[PDB]
């Protein structure tokens, strides 16, 4: 059963099949978010998102969609806005605390584990609902580049390429194809162009709406391991490469 009446009206309850349903409904909520992707380069991670420009009133260059948890960790989610940015703030707090204590940037696996523990904690007690956002995050540390994606259930895995949101199936298929064609690892410059291609392919689901796409990437070599947005000539090059499709 896809609904399981009775056992889904509260959090922290197992259904007869062993599933706890509120987490499943939270996963269903992730389906409604804007399509977002993250690609693990040979030496970095590239993030891209299809930010739908809802209205002309918004000032574009200041209402960002990608968030920096720490100067070396990039984070981007899809799902409920409140839960998403609250999780972003909490992860930023955790990274700042770790930097304050150990005087060094937090390694990505430790940050991912801390966020997984935080999110999973909300699936335990019935007074709180599970987070409704699937969060893609990653960066560069002493061990190289890591890309992660934690679900509303709290589960997370290391990904060579991840996608979340509404336009997720086509994006994930194209990302599987990309990883297949480049088993040796993509260069960050090529990865940005491929991410632009993938996002443009994902937009074909909702062509009727105008859109913009933010691209940000952290690479050990090209950006010294600091997360920066793509602007200027490189963004236009990635566009022109994507416009052929």
């Amino acid at each position: 059963t896809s609904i399981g009446t009775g056992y889904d009206l509260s959090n922290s309850v197992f259904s007869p099949d062993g599933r706890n349903f509120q987490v499943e409904y939270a996963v269903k909520a992730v389906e409604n978010g804007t399509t977002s992707i993250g690609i693990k380069c040979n030496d970095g991670v590239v993030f891209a998102v299809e930010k739908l420009i809802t209205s002309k009133l918004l000032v574009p260059q200041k209402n960002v969609k990608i968030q920096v948890v720490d100067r070396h960790i990039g984070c981007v989610y899809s799902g409920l806005i409140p839960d998403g940015r609250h999780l972003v703030n909490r992860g930023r707090e955790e990274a700042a605390s770790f930097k304050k204590l150990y005087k060094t940037p937090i390694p990505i696996p430790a940050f991912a584990d801390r966020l997984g523990q935080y999110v999973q904690a909300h699936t335990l007690y019935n007074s709180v609902r599970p987070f409704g956002v699937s969060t893609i995050f990653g960066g560069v540390d002493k061990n190289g580049a890591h890309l992660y994606m934690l679900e509303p259930s709290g589960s997370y895995w290391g990904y060579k390429g991840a996608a979340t949101g509404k336009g997720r199936q086509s994006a994930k298929a194209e990302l599987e194809k990309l990883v297949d064609h480049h088993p040796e690892g993509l260069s960050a410059r090529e990865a940005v162009k491929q991410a632009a291609k993938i996002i443009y392919l994902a937009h074909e689901d909702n062509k009727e709406k105008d859109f913009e796409l933010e691209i940000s990437w952290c690479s050990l070599s090209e950006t010294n391991g600091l997360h920066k947005f793509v602007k200027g000539d490189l963004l236009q090059e990635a566009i022109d490469f994507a416009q052929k499709e």
Partner: protein, 234 residues
């Protein structure tokens, strides 16, 4: 029908993934009176239509100042408007006193957003049912933030929230290419806001008492006009 079984509280998703109890809070804004805000690089303006309980009563305070550089206008629930306005004023005082620093509007928006979010997860509490427009001028330039009870804070050149806000918002979309360029004239900016709000009125046209305006910018600290002071703009 099936919505009725899952909107009991803000701690339960519906099988479609929707969180009804906060969609209701966002719909609560539509009960409140229209308020309009618009921005130019030199000044930012708020325009609010005040409502009175009866002909023998004084009008509601739609516009609140939190500091000499920033203020806000709000629509929705009074009990939540009080809480959020008081919290933001307290935080402005905290920033100005403990840190000797004017609270940046961009920081203030997210600082209020974080408080707004927590109510949408814990049982017993309910989402705030008020949407408010933070307006101010700081070192980075003019600002105008439309805060929604879902915890969404967004930078807008101009916006309108409240009952029949669609007309004012459409007029703002149609004249964004113009009202931004005013850039220095406060009178003309307030006038443009006044046409914007005038599109949202079905009855009870603008009057010296029901209309209220605010402005802030490079040279003007947040100042509120009402009564005879706004007779020239009507």
């Amino acid at each position: 029908m099936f919505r009725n079984n899952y909107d009991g509280d803000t701690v339960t998703f519906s099988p479609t993934g929707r969180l009804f109890q906060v969609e209701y809070a966002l719909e609560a804004i539509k009960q409140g009176s229209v308020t309009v805000g618009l921005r130019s690089n030199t000044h930012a303006v708020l325009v609010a239509l005040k409502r009175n309980a009866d002909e023998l009563s004084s009008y509601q305070k739609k516009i609140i100042k939190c500091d000499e550089h920033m203020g806000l206008s709000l629509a929705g629930l009074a009990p939540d408007a009080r809480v959020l306005s008081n919290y933001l004023r307290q935080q402005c005082n905290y920033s100005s006193l403990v840190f000797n620093r004017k609270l940046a509007v961009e920081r203030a928006g997210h600082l209020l957003c974080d408080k707004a979010q927590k109510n949408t997860q814990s049982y017993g509490g309910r989402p705030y049912g008020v949407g408010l427009l933070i307006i101010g001028y700081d070192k980075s330039g003019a600002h105008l933030l439309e805060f929604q009870p879902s915890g969404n804070v967004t930078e807008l050149y101009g916006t309108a929230i409240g009952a029949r806000s669609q007309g004012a918002k459409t007029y703002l979309e149609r004249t964004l290419d113009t009202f931004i360029k005013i850039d220095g004239n406060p009178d003309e900016l307030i006038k443009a806001g006044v046409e914007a709000i005038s599109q949202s009125l079905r009855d009870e046209s603008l009057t010296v008492d029901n209309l209220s305006i605010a402005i802030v910018g490079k040279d003007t600290p947040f100042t509120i006009y009402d009564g005879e002071a706004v007779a020239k703009y009507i």
